Amino acid sequence: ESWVAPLGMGYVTSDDVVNVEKVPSIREVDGAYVMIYDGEMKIKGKSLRAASDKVEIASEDITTGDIDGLFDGDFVLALTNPHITLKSNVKNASLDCSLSIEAENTSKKEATSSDFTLSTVSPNIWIGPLDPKTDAFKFVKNEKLPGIVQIVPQKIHLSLSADSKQWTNAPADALSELRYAVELPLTPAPEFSAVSVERIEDAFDEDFVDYIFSDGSARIYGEVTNEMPFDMSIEMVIMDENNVPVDIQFPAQEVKGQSGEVIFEITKEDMPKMKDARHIDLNLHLTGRDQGEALKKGQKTTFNLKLKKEGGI
16 A cells, blocks of 8 residues: 655756856856956056065955855855966066965955966966966966865955065066956865755645645655766755745755665654645755866756655554
């Protein structure tokens, strides 16, 4: 005496799970979502000389308050290859420089720095954890950069400093057109963590709950398919007609990789509470993997679930 009842298809795309629409910096580059902040650094005029070994020659504050919109609540934005590029027009000079990169939000502020020389022959710099292997750019490895980005900045501040003697002695037109680009490709790293909630509306019909949940026991189960570059720990919440949770809990169900079976048991003791069930919320606890897979438009996660009830009477 088994009953089986359909609950409807959870089925979400990348841009349902990750709110890329709420984030204006998002671009699609080669089918992959990437946040880009670009602009120019205003070069400062030459003011006498305090005898400091280095002098700040340009600064920029980048507003990045939209990044918070990718997920609701706190997340850890650990990415495989966030990087910063600098492009300069350097006429007849060679300058030993440092770039300070400071990220901050309301609870944290973290910073790193990289050193390089800006010259005629090498006027472009690429700072990040992975070498782009392009002759256009001098690569300066910085493996701390992903850690400052993972706090989820609301502001990034860039500060370019140069050796003081070199900067005073350089030709007056030596440096202009200082262009930056902060690129944050949504390729999660192992420390990535976020929560996304997916709603299956009208999973249970008011016209059948009294009969189906009278007694006995049941389970909600089936196959999940995942094309997105996150592992998921799925926590199921059953919601009533007012979107108030029904008082039933279940062990979370893990889905690592492209396919996984999940089972949420409804015990005899909890079955009568399901008379109030109408909707399902799947709380998807997302975590990074170590295979460097990118978030892409149109990747889907599918939740093929049904209810199977075993009689009491």
